[PDB]
Motif scaffolding. Structure first.
Motif, PDB file in Angstrom:
ATOM      1  N   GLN A  26       0.804  -1.207   0.000  1.00  0.00           N
ATOM      2  CA  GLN A  26       0.000   0.000   0.000  1.00  0.00           C
ATOM      3  C   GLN A  26       0.846   1.269   0.000  1.00  0.00           C
ATOM      4  OE1 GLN A  26      -0.619   0.920   4.553  1.00  0.00           O
ATOM      5  NE2 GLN A  26      -1.774  -0.931   4.059  1.00  0.00           N
ATOM      6  N   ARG A  30      -3.569  11.010   2.784  1.00  0.00           N
ATOM      7  CA  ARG A  30      -4.718  11.525   3.514  1.00  0.00           C
ATOM      8  C   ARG A  30      -5.603  12.322   2.569  1.00  0.00           C
ATOM      9  NH1 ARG A  30      -0.228  11.958   6.542  1.00  0.00           N
ATOM     10  NH2 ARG A  30      -0.199  11.347   8.755  1.00  0.00           N
ATOM     11  N   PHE A  60     -11.392   7.853  12.385  1.00  0.00           N
ATOM     12  CA  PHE A  60     -10.944   7.838  10.998  1.00  0.00           C
ATOM     13  C   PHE A  60     -11.503   6.642  10.267  1.00  0.00           C
ATOM     14  CE2 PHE A  60      -7.424   5.490  13.032  1.00  0.00           C
ATOM     15  CZ  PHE A  60      -7.153   4.470  12.147  1.00  0.00           C
ATOM     16  N   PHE A  64      -9.446   1.417   0.771  1.00  0.00           N
ATOM     17  CA  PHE A  64      -8.423   0.728  -0.015  1.00  0.00           C
ATOM     18  C   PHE A  64      -8.895   0.621  -1.455  1.00  0.00           C
ATOM     19  CE2 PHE A  64      -5.270  -0.297   3.149  1.00  0.00           C
ATOM     20  CZ  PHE A  64      -5.981  -0.224   4.325  1.00  0.00           C
ATOM     21  N   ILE A  81     -10.959  -8.586   4.549  1.00  0.00           N
ATOM     22  CA  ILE A  81      -9.759  -7.878   5.015  1.00  0.00           C
ATOM     23  C   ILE A  81      -8.498  -8.633   4.626  1.00  0.00           C
ATOM     24  CG2 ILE A  81      -8.443  -7.170   7.108  1.00  0.00           C
ATOM     25  CD1 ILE A  81     -11.313  -6.363   8.283  1.00  0.00           C
ATOM     26  N   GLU A  92      -4.198   3.464  -0.197  1.00  0.00           N
ATOM     27  CA  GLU A  92      -4.938   3.619   1.047  1.00  0.00           C
ATOM     28  C   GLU A  92      -5.253   5.108   1.227  1.00  0.00           C
ATOM     29  OE1 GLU A  92      -2.748   2.437   4.486  1.00  0.00           O
ATOM     30  OE2 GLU A  92      -4.122   3.390   5.901  1.00  0.00           O
ATOM     31  N   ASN A  96      -9.632  11.433   8.016  1.00  0.00           N
ATOM     32  CA  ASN A  96      -9.718  11.842   9.421  1.00  0.00           C
ATOM     33  C   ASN A  96     -11.042  12.602   9.497  1.00  0.00           C
ATOM     34  OD1 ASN A  96      -7.202  10.907  10.602  1.00  0.00           O
ATOM     35  ND2 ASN A  96      -6.201  12.340   9.216  1.00  0.00           N
TER      36      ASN A  96
ATOM     37  N   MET B 156      -3.199  -0.584  18.218  1.00  0.00           N
ATOM     38  CA  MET B 156      -3.357  -1.743  17.335  1.00  0.00           C
ATOM     39  C   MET B 156      -2.189  -2.699  17.409  1.00  0.00           C
ATOM     40  SD  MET B 156      -5.601  -0.481  14.124  1.00  0.00           S
ATOM     41  CE  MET B 156      -5.222   1.217  14.025  1.00  0.00           C
ATOM     42  N   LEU B 159       0.830  -4.790  14.418  1.00  0.00           N
ATOM     43  CA  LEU B 159       1.079  -3.876  13.298  1.00  0.00           C
ATOM     44  C   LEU B 159       2.230  -2.946  13.719  1.00  0.00           C
ATOM     45  CD1 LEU B 159      -1.557  -2.006  11.191  1.00  0.00           C
ATOM     46  CD2 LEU B 159       0.200  -0.697  12.288  1.00  0.00           C
ATOM     47  N   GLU B 171       4.807   0.887   7.077  1.00  0.00           N
ATOM     48  CA  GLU B 171       3.978  -0.022   7.864  1.00  0.00           C
ATOM     49  C   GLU B 171       4.398  -1.458   7.557  1.00  0.00           C
ATOM     50  OE1 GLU B 171      -0.688  -1.298   7.739  1.00  0.00           O
ATOM     51  OE2 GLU B 171      -0.203   0.830   7.482  1.00  0.00           O
ATOM     52  N   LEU B 181      -8.532  -7.190  14.699  1.00  0.00           N
ATOM     53  CA  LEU B 181      -8.342  -5.847  15.276  1.00  0.00           C
ATOM     54  C   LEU B 181      -9.590  -4.953  15.117  1.00  0.00           C
ATOM     55  CD1 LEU B 181      -4.671  -5.149  14.009  1.00  0.00           C
ATOM     56  CD2 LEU B 181      -5.368  -6.364  16.092  1.00  0.00           C
TER      57      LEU B 181
HETATM   58  C1  LIG Z   1      -5.142   6.977  10.696  1.00  0.00           C
HETATM   59  S1  LIG Z   1      -3.389   7.136  10.616  1.00  0.00           S
HETATM   60  O1  LIG Z   1      -3.096   8.285   9.687  1.00  0.00           O
HETATM   61  O2  LIG Z   1      -2.872   7.434  12.004  1.00  0.00           O
HETATM   62  N1  LIG Z   1      -2.737   5.763  10.059  1.00  0.00           N
HETATM   63  C2  LIG Z   1      -2.810   4.586  10.696  1.00  0.00           C
HETATM   64  C3  LIG Z   1      -2.377   4.396  12.018  1.00  0.00           C
HETATM   65  C4  LIG Z   1      -2.430   3.119  12.585  1.00  0.00           C
HETATM   66  C5  LIG Z   1      -2.880   2.019  11.826  1.00  0.00           C
HETATM   67  C6  LIG Z   1      -3.358   2.208  10.531  1.00  0.00           C
HETATM   68  C7  LIG Z   1      -3.745   1.139   9.703  1.00  0.00           C
HETATM   69  C8  LIG Z   1      -4.668   0.132  10.043  1.00  0.00           C
HETATM   70  C9  LIG Z   1      -5.028  -0.873   9.108  1.00  0.00           C
HETATM   71  C10 LIG Z   1      -5.977  -1.877   9.420  1.00  0.00           C
HETATM   72  C11 LIG Z   1      -6.033  -2.410  10.722  1.00  0.00           C
HETATM   73  C12 LIG Z   1      -6.970  -3.409  11.030  1.00  0.00           C
HETATM   74  C13 LIG Z   1      -7.833  -3.904  10.052  1.00  0.00           C
HETATM   75  C14 LIG Z   1      -7.808  -3.387   8.752  1.00  0.00           C
HETATM   76  C15 LIG Z   1      -6.849  -2.398   8.434  1.00  0.00           C
HETATM   77  C16 LIG Z   1      -4.426  -0.831   7.827  1.00  0.00           C
HETATM   78  C17 LIG Z   1      -3.500   0.168   7.496  1.00  0.00           C
HETATM   79  O3  LIG Z   1      -2.940   0.221   6.388  1.00  0.00           O
HETATM   80  N2  LIG Z   1      -3.167   1.134   8.424  1.00  0.00           N
HETATM   81  O4  LIG Z   1      -2.262   2.158   8.025  1.00  0.00           O
HETATM   82  C18 LIG Z   1      -3.285   3.489   9.977  1.00  0.00           C
END
Ligand SMILES: CS(=O)(=O)Nc1cccc(-c2cc(-c3ccccc3)cc(=O)n2O)c1
Ligand SMILES: CS(=O)(=O)Nc1cccc(-c2cc(-c3ccccc3)cc(=O)n2O)c1
Ligand SMILES: [Zn+2]
Ligand SMILES: [Zn+2]
Lengths: 176, 182
Positions: A26, A30, A60, A64, A81, A92, A96, B156, B159, B171, B181
């Motif tokens: 990915q 934003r 948020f 995808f 998922i 992605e 927000n 989370m 991750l 990530e 999650l």
């Molecule tokens: C909102 S943010 O700008 O602070 N970014 C952010 C922070 C923490 C995790 C995720 C995340 C979750 C997940 C996710 C978690 C659980 C189930 C499905 C997707 C996918 C993913 O790609 N990300 O980045 C994204």
């Protein structure tokens, strides 16, 4: 000056066996308003919304987008998922909550101070016909295919102003 | 118990904004994500040695004083030797990373790029799917990689976020352990 081909190769290492199944999954951007972004990525660019994840506790949503067949999206939640987050090359979009209602808010595209990220790029079979369709759709262009030095290469913008390169891999070697 | 507020879009409202892919876009692919890098020597070492990507194409543009380094999860034995064939093959790979080196940035101590994760925000991160987030992060720790979020730290679990030499966030996720999650 730049690195020589040999100097760059000397900085590279062979892939450790523990990384053999890693994949680039990915790129996250934003987005101020997901309604505008979803319309652009699906209707204009032809991507498919393969998964949407809402995180009410954290205020948020994640969208995808991918070049996948909509009929390959699984029916079941958890199966969805696992499939979506294992597709290569997804985009992605992070919403927000509330940015769409803040008239002074906007995200930065990385192409003016302070710079960092530059663009995503889509490979297409014909840059000119793709861009003729984008023009008909009212898409904003940073660079039309025949503007400037590099002919047959374009940059469009999405609703947040992120730059998207439009390139034909078979017409790039001539630019060297 | 009262539930947390439900902002943003519903699944159905999001789908109301989605249109079927136009047939003229049937062969389009998401080919690259471009990031500017201060020192390509450090970036190439990170993406190849730490992450296991391969340098598939190097492009130099002396008049414009920059180079491009295309990184991807590709077998090095699939890289064509002939210049024109190599470019057409590399630029037709899905999911590549284009690292832009503006010549001279590596010599300037006061110069650095912006990762998009502090004001002004925009781009957030790239993400790599792995079979085991925990063993991958144990290895990153052994290699001295800088972390933004360890796998079990924060909200989370399972991750992680690491950083590359320019501070861009990456990530680290296991797609088979994400649904739990929600
Ligand atoms: C909102 S943010 O700008 O602070 N970014 C952010 C922070 C923490 C995790 C995720 C995340 C979750 C997940 C996710 C978690 C659980 C189930 C499905 C997707 C996918 C993913 O790609 N990300 O980045 C994204
Ligand atoms: C220095 S910059 O930040 O302004 N970027 C930039 C400027 C001009 C062209 C390209 C480009 C070329 C090429 C390219 C051209 C010919 C042969 C191979 C690659 C690929 C590509 O993805 N991009 O973006 C990139
Ligand atoms: Zn992410
Ligand atoms: Zn590019």
């Amino acid at each position: 000056g730049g690195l020589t081909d040999e100097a760059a190769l000397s900085c590279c290492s062979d892939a450790d066996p523990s990384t053999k199944d890693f994949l680039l999954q990915q790129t996250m951007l934003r987005v101020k308003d997901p309604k505008k972004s979803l319309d652009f990525y699906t209707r204009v660019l032809g991507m498919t919304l393969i998964q949407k994840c809402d995180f009410p506790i954290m205020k948020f949503s994640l969208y995808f987008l991918a070049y996948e067949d909509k009929n390959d999206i699984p029916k079941e939640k958890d199966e969805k998922i696992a499939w979506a987050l294992s597709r290569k090359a997804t985009l992605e979009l992070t919403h927000n909550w509330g940015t769409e209602d803040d008239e002074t808010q906007s995200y930065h595209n990385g192409n003016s101070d302070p710079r960092g990220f530059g663009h995503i790029g889509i490979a297409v079979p014909d840059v000119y016909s793709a861009c003729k369709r984008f023009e008909e759709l009212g898409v904003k262009f940073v660079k039309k295919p025949d503007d400037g030095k590099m002919k047959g290469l374009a940059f469009i913008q999405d609703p947040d102003g992120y730059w998207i390169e439009i390139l034909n891999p078979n017409k790039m070697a001539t630019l060297m």
